[PDB]
Design a protein around this ligand. Structure first.
Ligand SMILES: Nc1ncnc2c1ncn2[C@@H]1O[C@H](COP(=O)(O)OP(=O)(O)OP(=O)(O)O)[C@@H](O)[C@H]1O
Ligand SMILES: Nc1ncnc2c1ncn2[C@@H]1O[C@H](COP(=O)(O)OP(=O)(O)OP(=O)(O)O)[C@@H](O)[C@H]1O
Ligand SMILES: [Zn+2]
Ligand SMILES: [Zn+2]
Lengths: 362, 96, 184, 145, 48
């Protein structure tokens, strides 16, 4: 019983771990299939209902089968992750916890910053009785005790590390025998390490890739309530194909620079909005019939919205959109305004964006 | 050009010592030789601290070396700074 | 300084080494305060000069703005600075940095909520998961397990992993609720 | 075969102008500037199609009353009622438009989804028109270098 | 390409002597050896 259920479970573990990646862009293949079927999707008629057009006539059941298959394959990918990739993550976390417990005494000599999520959360795994479960070094608790035994106190060190003070000497001495068998389910439940499993689950939940795969699950599940949620799974190509990773790294390599450039563009356009709101307000009428005008710069929030929506997008600049200044007292002032807008915003800043991307490539 | 200038500065610092100007390989003939030399033997921060030490220290209390460096500094004659030589090169055969 | 001078002037002397094992403690204490430079002495010879580096000077030099100034100076003296005037520019930089260090020393005279919320969410959500295991009801669940079934094994495995994912979603929801509460 | 078919239709001789790529090695450098990163360019065009399809999903769900294209209001030509038509519209007119899809679609002033549509249009302009085309230029320049 | 050519010329002049073609390090084994050699011993202006 206990001899065979665990064996079959391990068989399933091994199968999923072996097939993880294949089940990963199998998921992408199904995602491209569902999204290709979705291109044949029409609105037809209060509530409006969407009808999937089908020349073949059976595309709707095929789409439902594909949706069920996708929400199953995503779950199998979650399982494959939790079988294959999480033991390595735990092995890492355990080796760093051990090597900061020993060489830095991160919980003896000093204390975590209380701003480190993992630094605070790892405090539980110190006192677990199944520590380096993944890490090879099974002697870390004794090494730390030898290093810090005399100064910080053997009792304090042993209570922190969970070492049985009064019981280790007795174990060296005469040992009492207790009948224990794996066939006892209660004994198995006593044997399992609750706190270590809690810490492991915390680490898994804090893992980034597990969170991405959980998002992949939730999107696939919600795709049943609304079929268009399967379009979000097309975002997985960035990680599925490393060929696209170079192109995307061309952008993300200078991502902070791009964000700061967009902020600077917003500041410059806001300065231009201040200038326009003060001196050039009679030129921002947008109405067609002159009876009632739609003044886009009477309120400065509206003026700023106008400048960053229509002005920046316009090829020539804000002047291609705003009225003509011919025969006005501020003609030259407005010409300087428009030309500076074109040269600074349209020409230079966008050139900064292109330059950042090209420099990232190089 | 800005990025290439950054790379130029970085690789200059990683290949040559700032004061002596000797390549990293000669020091690296002994393990960790380059960073040992640039952090103990020829540290620019150490030279700055030595200038501070001479400036704050009284002139009369100067030792022989301190008086030598003080005179050459006051006349702005930068030859106490080792160029092309180091303690290792001077005692290559003798030290090791 | 005496011991360090002797140690560096004799790479290989066992007796002086033994005195070094007698005197790490003093040496380790005085390591931050002992400076070492090489100069071309009056004998056409490179000599090492040992001096005092004060704690205040060390701290002022390790101030971040002084390091930004150092980086800027290195950038300048490498990119546009010439070989001939390099160590004139270096002395000018040293003088100015010494002045600003002295002025700074003279004038200087005499998140957690989010982390707490995340730990609380993890603790509570994983304790809820542990409650089901601590129920001792697996013996009752052995009703359909005693009747051995591959389908039963597969369903149990899948249900366990699905319960794990359920717990993860509950953890995310609790994190968001605590976030909205903690800003408010 | 092209030269022979040129007798049945004289315009087939225009295809022989494609031979300059191999005839002149001077043009070979310019053409290698493109073909050196050809796989990268093809993948970038595919990624652009995926991004525009995502925008098509968003528009087909929430912004459908803004895609009328008719001149006389009696009969409207709705370009996003069918999502294949909406995707065709987004990759034909939207991508080619300088400002983006917003230069073509209706104006959102005085509507409940004004800010949502402004975010939609601005993100379209910045991601598709600005960045992806900048990726194309960057690939060509990097190939030259 | 123009900027790289400028850099090429500059670093060629700073690393090798124009006439002899010897690297700067050999001269720099004596302090200020490179500029001493290129301004007194092997000056192209002097050859002209
Ligand atoms: N004379 C020298 N003094 C210091 N470093 C030198 C010297 N010659 C070469 N170097 C090298 O230059 C590197 C850069 O030194 P530096 O500490 O100034 O750099 P940093 O990364 O900007 O600063 P830090 O890490 O101290 O904040 C050193 O690690 C060393 O390998
Ligand atoms: N044979 C050589 N003659 C002159 N300089 C040489 C020679 N070989 C190498 N060099 C190096 O080339 C550097 C450039 O010399 P040059 O005086 O022509 O440069 P410049 O900065 O354009 O001129 P200048 O400062 O005299 O107006 C010299 O400083 C020297 O270090
Ligand atoms: Zn040096
Ligand atoms: Zn020469």
């Amino acid at each position: 019983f206990w001899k065979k259920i665990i064996a079959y479970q391990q068989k399933l573990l091994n199968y999923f771990a072996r097939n993880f990646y294949n089940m990963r862009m199998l998921a992408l293949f199904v995602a491209f299939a569902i999204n290709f079927i979705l291109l044949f999707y029409k609105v037809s008629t209060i509530a409006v209902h969407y009808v999937l057009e089908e020349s073949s006539g059976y595309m709707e059941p095929t789409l439902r089968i594909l949706a069920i298959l996708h929400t199953v394959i995503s779950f199998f990918c979650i399982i494959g992750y939790y079988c294959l990739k999480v033991p390595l993550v735990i092995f890492k976390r355990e080796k760093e916890v051990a090597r900061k417990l020993e060489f830095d005494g991160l919980y003896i000599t000093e204390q975590p910053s209380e701003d480190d999520i993992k630094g605070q959360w790892d405090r539980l795994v110190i006192n677990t009785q199944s520590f380096p479960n993944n890490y090879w070094d099974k002697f870390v608790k004794r090494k730390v005790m030898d290093k810090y035994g005399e100064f910080y106190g053997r009792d304090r060190i042993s209570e922190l590390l969970g070492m049985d003070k009064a019981a280790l000497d007795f174990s060296d001495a005469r040992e009492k025998k207790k009948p224990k068998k794996d066939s006892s389910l209660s004994a198995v439940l006593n044997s399992i390490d609750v706190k270590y499993q809690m810490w492991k689950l915390g680490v898994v939940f804090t893992d980034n890739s597990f969170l991405y795969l959980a998002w992949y699950m939730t999107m696939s599940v919600l795709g049943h309530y609304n079929n268009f949620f399967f379009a979000a799974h097309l975002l997985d190509i960035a990680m599925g194909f490393k060929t696209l990773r170079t192109i995307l790294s061309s952008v993300t390599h200078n991502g902070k620079q791009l964000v700061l450039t967009v902020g600077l563009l917003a500041v410059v356009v806001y300065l231009y909005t201040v200038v326009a709101f003060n001196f050039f307000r009679k030129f921002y009428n947008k109405s067609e019939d002159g009876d009632t005008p739609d003044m886009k710069c009477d309120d400065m929030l509206t003026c700023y919205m106008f400048h960053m929506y229509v002005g920046v997008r316009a090829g020539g600049g804000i002047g291609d959109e705003i009225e003509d200044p011919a025969g006005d007292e501020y003609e030259i002032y407005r010409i300087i305004f428009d030309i500076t807008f074109f040269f600074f915003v349209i020409v230079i800043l966008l050139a900064i964006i292109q330059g950042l991307i090209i420099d990232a490539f190089g | 050009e800005l990025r290439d200038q950054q790379e130029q500065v970085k690789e200059d610092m990683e290949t040559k010592c700032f004061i002596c100007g000797i390549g990293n390989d000669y020091f690296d003939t002994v393990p960790h030789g380059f960073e040992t030399h640039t952090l103990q033997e020829h540290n620019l921060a150490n030279y700055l601290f030595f200038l501070m030490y001479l400036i704050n220290k009284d002139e009369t209390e100067h030792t022989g070396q301190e008086s030598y460096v003080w005179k050459m500094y006051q006349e702005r004659c930068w030859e106490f700074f080792p160029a092309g030589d180091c303690f290792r090169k001077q005692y290559e055969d003798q030290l090791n | 300084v005496l011991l360090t001078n002797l140690s560096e002037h004799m790479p290989n002397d066992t007796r002086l080494q033994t005195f070094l094992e007698l005197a790490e403690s003093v040496l380790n204490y005085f390591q931050p305060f002992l400076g070492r430079i090489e100069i071309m002495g009056s004998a056409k010879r490179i000599e090492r000069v040992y001096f005092e580096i004060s704690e205040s000077s060390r701290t002022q030099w390790e101030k971040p703005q002084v390091k930004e100034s150092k980086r800027q100076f290195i950038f300048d003296v490498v990119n546009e600075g010439g070989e001939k005037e390099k160590m004139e520019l270096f002395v000018n930089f040293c003088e100015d940095t010494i002045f600003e260090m002295q002025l700074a020393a003279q004038i200087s005279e005499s998140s957690i909520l989010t982390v707490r919320s995340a730990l609380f969410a993890l603790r509570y959500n994983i304790l809820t998961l542990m409650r089901m295991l601590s129920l001792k009801s697996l013996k009752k669940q052995m009703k359909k397990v005693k009747k051995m079934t591959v389908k039963d094994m597969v369903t149990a495995f899948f249900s366990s992993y699905w319960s794990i994912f359920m717990t993860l979603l509950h953890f995310v929801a609790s994190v968001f609720r605590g976030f909205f509460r903690i800003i408010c």
